[PDB]
C-alpha cells in the first residue's frame, strides 16, 4: 500500500447497461478495481444506477448520478469528483459534467458508445420484424425484471426499451446535439475533440480509451470475418472459462458486418473516441475493460486493473 492512486478529488466509478455496483449483491461490476485503487490510496465510490434507462430525463441515469455525486461530496467534504464511466456510464458522466460542471473535475470514458452501437441498431431492428409488436413488450418485461432482480438495491426504475433506444446510433447522435461536448469530434469524423473543456468557468480534464480485440480480417463474397486478437487462436483458456469471450466475438462479428470496423464486441473504436484518447489499441473485448468475467482475459490482453490504477496516478499528476 501507498498513495500511487491518491487523487485530489474522489473517484466515482460509473457502470453502464445491465449494471449496478454489485449484481445480486454478490458480483462487483468493477471486478476487483475498487479494492485495488483503495489499496493504492484512492478515495473511490461506486455508483449504483438503473441498469436499464436513458441518461437524460427526470428519472434517468444522469439525474441519479447527480444525486449520488452530491452525497459523495457531502460524505467526503470534497467539492468535485472525477467521473470514470464504462460503456453507457461514460454517457451518464457526460450528462453530469454538462448539467453540474462545478461538481466535476474530470470525465474518463472506457468503451463508451459516444456515437451509439451498431449492435443496438441490430437488436432494435430485429424487434421491428414482429408486426404485432408483442416481442418488444415481452422481452422488455423480461429484461426489466432481470434489472430489478440483479440491482443490488432491487431498483424498480428499469426501462429496457428506453435503454436500447438510447444506445442506437441515431439516438446517440441526437444525444450529442442535446449534450454537446468540446471533447467530441464532428459527427461522422471518427475523430476526438479537445483534451479539456471549460463549462461555466469550471475546467474538466477529459480522457478515453477503447478496446479493439475484435478486428475485421477477411472479406469474402461481401461477408466480413473477424479475429479476436485478445486470444491465442482457438485454444486460449479464456474462450473456455469466460463465456463473454466467445459471445463478444459473436456480437463483434455482427458489428463488423454492419460496417463498424474494429470494436470490443459492442462498441466501435470510432464510437469510443472522446477527449484525450489515451489508447485504442488494447486487445480487449468490452468486458475485459472492467476485468470481467471474474478477471479472466485472453493471453494477449493487457491488465485492465493496472491500466485503471495508472490512470488514477495520471489524474493525480494532472492536479485532480
Ligand atoms: Ca474477459
The alpha helices in 157-242, defined as continuous H runs, are 160-166, 169-178, 237-241
- Mark the binding-site residues for Ca(2+), compressed into ranges: 242, 288, 292, 296
Q: What angle do CA 189, 190, 192 make, to 5 degrees?
A: 95
Helix, strand, coil proportions of the chain in percent (round to 5)?
40, 20, 40
Going from the Cα of 179 to the center of ligand 1, the distance in angstroms, rounded, reads 32
Place of cell 437524460: 56
Query: What contacts 308, CB < 8 A, 6 or more positions away?
Result: 33, 36, 37, 84
The alpha helices in 77-133, defined as continuous H runs, are 88-99, 118-127
Distance CA 103, CA 88 (A): 20
How many angstroms from the chain centroid is the CA of residue 288?
11
Look up the CATH architecture of domain 1-320.
3-Layer(aba) Sandwich (3.40)
- Mark the binding-site residues, compressed into ranges: 17, 88, 242, 288, 292, 296
Phi and psi, residue 218, nearest 5°:
-155, 145
Q: Please tell me whether the peptide bond between 12 and the residue prior to it is cis, using omega within 30 degrees of 0.
A: no
Distance CA 264, CA 214 (A): 6
Distance CA 82, CA 104 (A): 6
Q: Which three cell numbers stand for residue 153?
A: 438495491
Q: Which three cell numbers stand for residue 307?
A: 491500466
Distance CA 299, CA 305 (A): 15
Q: In the beta sheet, which residues pair with residue 199?
A: 202
Beta carbons of 69 and 48 less than 8 angstroms apart: no
Give the residue among 76, 77, 65, 70 at the shortest CA–CA distance from 102: 70
Beta carbons of 210 and 280 less than 8 angstroms apart: yes
Kindly state the helix (H) or strand (E) to which residue 155 belongs, with its residue range: none
Going from the Cα of 240 to the center of ligand 1, the distance in angstroms, rounded, reads 11
Length of the chain: 320
Q: What angle do CA 169, 114, 71 make, to 5 degrees?
A: 125
Q: Which three cell numbers stand for residue 279?
A: 489508447
Give me the active site residues, please.
Answer: 87, 264, 286
Assign residue 256 a region: left if phi > 0, alpha if psi is -120 to 50, beta otherwise? alpha
Q: Which three cell numbers stand for residue 312?
A: 488514477
Q: What is the DSSP string of 22-82?
A: EETTTEESSTTHHHHHHHTT--EEE----SS--SSSTTSHHHHHHHHHHHHHHHH--S-EE
- Mark the binding-site residues for substrate, compressed into ranges: 17, 88
Pairing of β 223-228 and β 202-211: unpaired
Task: Identify how the structure was determined.
Answer: X-ray
Q: In 3-state terms, what secondary structure has residue 291?
A: coil
Task: Centre a 10 Å sphere on the Cβ of residue 71 and count the other Cβ atoms it contains.
Answer: 10
Rounded to 10°, the helix 118-127/134-150 angle is 130
Beta carbons of 290 and 304 less than 8 angstroms apart: yes
Q: In the beta sheet, which residues pair with residue 30?
A: none
Distance CA 100, CA 285 (A): 32
Going from the Cα of 291 to the center of ligand 1, the distance in angstroms, rounded, reads 7
Phi and psi, residue 253, nearest 5°:
-70, -40
Break the chain into its structural domains and give their ranges: 1-320
Longest distance between any two alpha carbons in the chain, whole Å:
61
Rounded to 10°, the helix 118-127/243-256 angle is 80
How many angstroms from the chain centroid is the CA of residue 12?
13
Give the residue among 201, 183, 161 at the shortest CA–CA distance from 115: 183
Q: In the beta sheet, which residues pair with residue 279?
A: 209
Going from the Cα of 261 to the center of ligand 1, the distance in angstroms, rounded, reads 21
115, 227, 248 from 119: Cα distances, Å: 12, 17, 11
Amino acid at each position: 500500500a501507498d498513495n500511487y492512486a491518491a487523487t485530489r478529488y474522489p473517484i466515482i466509478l460509473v457502470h453502464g447497461l445491465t449494471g449496478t455496483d454489485k449484481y445480486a449483491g454478490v458480483l462487483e461490476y468493477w471486478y476487483g478495481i475498487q479494492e485495488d485503487l483503495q489499496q493504492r490510496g484512492a478515495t473511490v465510490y461506486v455508483a449504483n444506477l438503473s441498469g436499464f434507462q436513458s441518461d437524460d430525463g427526470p428519472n434517468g441515469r444522469g439525474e441519479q448520478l447527480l444525486a449520488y455525486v452530491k452525497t459523495v461530496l457531502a460524505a467526503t467534504g470534497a467539492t468535485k469528483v472525477n467521473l470514470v464511466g464504462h460503456s453507457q456510464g461514460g454517457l451518464t458522466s457526460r450528462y453530469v459534467a454538462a448539467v453540474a460542471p462545478d461538481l466535476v473535475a474530470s470525465v474518463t470514458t472506457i468503451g463508451t458508445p459516444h456515437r451509439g452501437s451498431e449492435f443496438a441498431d441490430f437488436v432494435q431492428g430485429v424487434l421491428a420484424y414482429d408486426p404485432t409488436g408483442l416481442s418488444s413488450t415481452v422481452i422488455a418485461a423480461f429484461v426489466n425484471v432481470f434489472g430489478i432482480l440483479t440491482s443490488s438495491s432491487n431498483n424498480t426504475n428499469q426501462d429496457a426499451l428506453a435503454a436500447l433506444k438510447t444506445l442506437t446510433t441515431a439516438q446517440a447522435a441526437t444525444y450529442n446535439q442535446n449534450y454537446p461536448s468540446a471533447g467530441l469530434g464532428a459527427p461522422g469524423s471518427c475523430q476526438t475533440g479537445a483534451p479539456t473543456e471549460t463549462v461555466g468557468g469550471n475546467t474538466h480534464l477529459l480522457y478515453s480509451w477503447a478496446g479493439t480485440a475484435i478486428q475485421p480480417t477477411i472479406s469474402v463474397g461481401g461477408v466480413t470475418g473477424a479475429t479476436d486478437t485478445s486470444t491465442i487462436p482457438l485454444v486460449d483458456p479464456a474462450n473456455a472459462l469466460d463465456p463473454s469471450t466467445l459471445a463478444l466475438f459473436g456480437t463483434g462479428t455482427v458489428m463488423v458486418n454492419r460496417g463498424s470496423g474494429q470494436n470490443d464486441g459492442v462498441v466501435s473504436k470510432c464510437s469510443a473516441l472522446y477527449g484525450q484518447v489515451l489508447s485504442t489499441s488494447y486487445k480487449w473485448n468490452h468486458l475485459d475493460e472492467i476485468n470481467q468475467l471474474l478477471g479472466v482475459r485472453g493471453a494477449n490482453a493487457e491488465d485492465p486493473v493496472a491500466v485503471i490504477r495508472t490512470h488514477a496516478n495520471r489524474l493525480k499528476l494532472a492536479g485532480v
